[PDB]
Design a protein around this ligand. Structure first.
Ligand code: HEM
Ligand code: HEM
Ligand code: KL7
Ligand code: KL7
Ligand code: H4B
Ligand code: H4B
Ligand code: ZN
Lengths: 413, 408
């Protein structure tokens, strides 16, 4: 690989130089002859696999605190090596855990919100042993991160994987999501993205209200045991009813959304250790709700009803009735969150912040891996500055990774 | 290995085998993806490239290994020997030009690829000849508004000192003028090219929509200026179907999009002058040409006339104005019966095209970064379509601007 790589911004002519790609660890999926940049997704570590992975992370940590090569650095290396020898695994210090989690966010090429990466509140839940205890930790996470609408980014980290038969898992894909119910006639009530998980909950004992916006229960697995159901206390679930500053009829659509986006199905990898339950939360970019959740055809799919109430001609695509309604929906989402004082960022502000963040990372870190396909927002892409910014994508560790859905792998007791 | 692509909206899965036929590089490696980077012979090298292309041509007409196939291979071999190059048959030129379009991973309009009028201009020797060929192209492709796809192919490169080049980036474009007070009148994308035309003698009208002259280089000589006859240049005044004040913005655009700075590569031969044209997708004018900060940059003016609150980004005033501008563009072209396609229809056609190509050909190289439209991405079907990008030949390639290589 070449030592310096240049990226250009085609609207400002700014050229940045990346050297950080030389620390790339895992594979992108691309080759010299094919690029998999738009592919959405392109039994443990042995003692011998673990040694070099831990040393790499420990070296990186001691370099970050300006103590590389120090007595404490060499001592930590030796203590980790011994621990891997006698137990075939090792435990992270609290300092290392916090550094690792922050950097997994810093390295997340698909995240436009990373200017905030260093202000992550890390909750250490490695002492947790039961699903009730997981429920307690998650309730505390939700209450802290919500903060009455002044949202704060946070992560809660449950015990790492050991032999793969004792995984901690949150079976929910996000901590707060709405149920979906398939009907005998083929229609769907609620959120069509969550139909599979809803059916699982119902099979596990959940009594479904069968409404349009039913907060799903938590389904929590500790130490490889069968998962258990818990209802989040509704006073902890902050929600925003959606209304429009101009269209009085918009509130009559009965739409609302939850304030806290909190991913709970990813895997956090630090120094070769695997934290399979590590729910993390931030705050929304408006388009995640107003474009994807609401206007995706396989989601709530409200473009038609909004367009009807806007009295647009919906017979010709070239009237751009979809585009016109999509903007108003996103105007309403941003207006409703700001009116209720719940943190939210519009796509113009977020992408301008990300450009400033990326320039700082190139200057102070030597690069910033970024996945253009994910960074550019799903509406008005080219009137945001990220559209014109060349990006390099590569995988640094620590990182957040996808993992198989737990119902596909769990050995029922 | 067989590679699968999934559409996440329809859950349709396609299987790609065609990528096994590529050997040009993408720029990516196993460790770094450059998918959002815009730009990442001899007798010795020529014959294998020639043979590959002849092979796929005779394989395409189902006479692979025929006597005609055998004879052409040896004919081409003797010619690369005795002349250091070779000349394509007419049938081969047409096939190679259609397939360069079919292979253009960044083009959402490829459902049309085999409806392409190919104009053979390989006997051209002077800039006057190029001008005549180009005027004929423009008149044919414009067709009084019923636009027809076309390409004109000038003589191939020989030693690199005798290149044919269209110095314009598109056949029809608007001049851009650096103002004394610091700003820009016209189109800022073209400020440099406009200055070169003035430096070469063109008398600029210093307006907002001044059609640039053609600047044409033949056989490596200095380029020459030519005015396209105005009756050949079809233009559309932009008005809005509800905002009657929109026409008072004074906006217009040309109907014929015609790229003239790329390089066409067929069987290892390089055609440095190959202007090709089709018809517009509305967002090309309404989103990029009008609203890029480094282009005409009219969002502020439009949002003014709509009386939108412009103090905070979160009112989405930019997004509102953007949609109205794009409604006006489509409405104006359609009212004047000038061919144009909206991004919803275009991307729908491209998904259908992908389906056709997977069935009959085993895949379709496609660049998601370029295929997805610059507005309303995820409400178009391409947003949810996984795509494999790879380089098949014949192809269109970028080349350096001639004013950085030419010696006068
Ligand atoms: C603080 C405000 C934040 C904002 C505005 C934000 C914004 C976003 C957005 C818009 C996406 C694309 C989401 C999608 O289309 O599904 C994304 C992806 C992602 N974010 Fe952030 N995020 C924030 C906080 C966080 C935090 C705290 C973490 C982890 C510590 C994080 C990690 C990620 C990851 C891993 C992805 C990619 C996951 C995937 O591949 O699906 N984000 N973010
Ligand atoms: C017939 C109607 C056509 C439509 C609607 C169409 C649409 C488009 C659009 C919207 C783009 C992106 C352009 C940009 O963002 O600057 C594009 C790219 C491209 N088109 Fe098509 N196109 C058409 C015809 C053609 C023809 C006839 C050719 C060649 C014979 C062609 C070759 C290309 C190439 C090579 C690119 C990629 C350019 C690059 O790499 O920068 N297109 N097309
Ligand atoms: C922490 C946070 C901030 C924010 N603004 N939005 C979210 C929800 C969107 C989102 C992510 F960001 C990251 C990951 C997922 C889930 C991965 C799903 N993959 C397979 C499409 C996600 F759905 C989370
Ligand atoms: C044939 C045709 C149909 C259509 N719809 N639009 C156009 C103009 C846009 C366009 C292209 F398509 C292809 C290439 C360029 C040149 C882009 C500049 N390079 C340096 C990125 C272009 F600017 C041409
Ligand atoms: C940096 C990035 O590659 C660049 O802005 C690309 C992105 N996608 C694009 N897509 C199209 N259709 N046209 C473009 O000019 C671009 N520009
Ligand atoms: C096929 C394609 O990769 C898929 O639709 C991706 C595109 N980009 C995205 N970008 C974001 N932010 N979120 C997404 O879910 C997707 N989906
Ligand atoms: Zn790639």
């Amino acid at each position: 690989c070449p030592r310096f790589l240049k990226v250009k911004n085609w609207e400002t002519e700014v050229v940045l130089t990346d050297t950080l790609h030389l620390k790339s660890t895992l594979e992108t999926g691309c080759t010299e002859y094919i690029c998999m940049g738009s592919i959405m997704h392109p039994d443990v570590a042995t003692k011998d696999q673990l040694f070099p992975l831990a040393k790499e992370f420990i070296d990186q940590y001691y370099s970050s605190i300006k103590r590389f090569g120090s007595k404490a650095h060499m001592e930590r290396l030796e203590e980790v090596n011994k621990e891997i020898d006698t137990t075939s695994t090792y435990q992270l210090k609290d300092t290392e855990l916090i550094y690792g989690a922050k950097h997994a966010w810093r390295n997340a090429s698909r995240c436009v919100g990373r200017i905030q990466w260093s202000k992550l509140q890390v909750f250490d839940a490695r002492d947790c042993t039961t699903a009730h205890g997981m429920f307690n930790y998650i309730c505390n996470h939700v209450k802290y991160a919500t903060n009455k609408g002044n949202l704060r980014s946070a992560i809660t980290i449950f015990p790492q994987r050991t032999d793969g038969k004792h995984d901690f898992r949150v079976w929910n894909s996000q901590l707060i999501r709405y149920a979906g119910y398939k009907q005998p006639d083929g229609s769907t009530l609620g959120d069509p993205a969550n139909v599979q998980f809803t059916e699982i909950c119902i099979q596990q004992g959940w009594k479904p209200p069968r409404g349009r916006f039913d907060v799903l229960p938590l389904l929590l697995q500790a130490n490889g045991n069968d998962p258990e159901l818990f209802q989040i206390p509704p006073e902890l679930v902050l929600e925003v009813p959606i209304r429009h500053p101009k269209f009085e009829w918009f509130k009559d659509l009965g739409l609302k959304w939850y304030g806290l986006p909190a991913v709970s199905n990813m895997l956090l990898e630090i120094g070769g250790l695997e934290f399979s339950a590590c729910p993390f939360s931030g705050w929304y970019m408006g388009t995640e709700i107003g474009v994807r959740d609401y206007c995706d055809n396989s989601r709530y799919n409200i473009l038609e009803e909004v367009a009807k109430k806007m009295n647009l001609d919906m017979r010709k695509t070239s009237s751009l009735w979809k585009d016109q309604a999509l903007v108003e929906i996103n105007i309403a989402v941003l207006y409703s969150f700001q009116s209720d004082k719940v943190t939210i960022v519009d796509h113009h502000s977020a992408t301008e912040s990300f450009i400033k963040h990326m320039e700082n990372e190139y200057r102070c870190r030597g690069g910033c891996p970024a996945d253009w396909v994910w960074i550019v927002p799903p509406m008005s892409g080219s009137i945001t500055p990220v559209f014109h910014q060349e990006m390099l994508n590569y995988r640094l560790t620590p990182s957040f990774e996808y993992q198989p859905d737990p119902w596909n792998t769990h050995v029922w007791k």
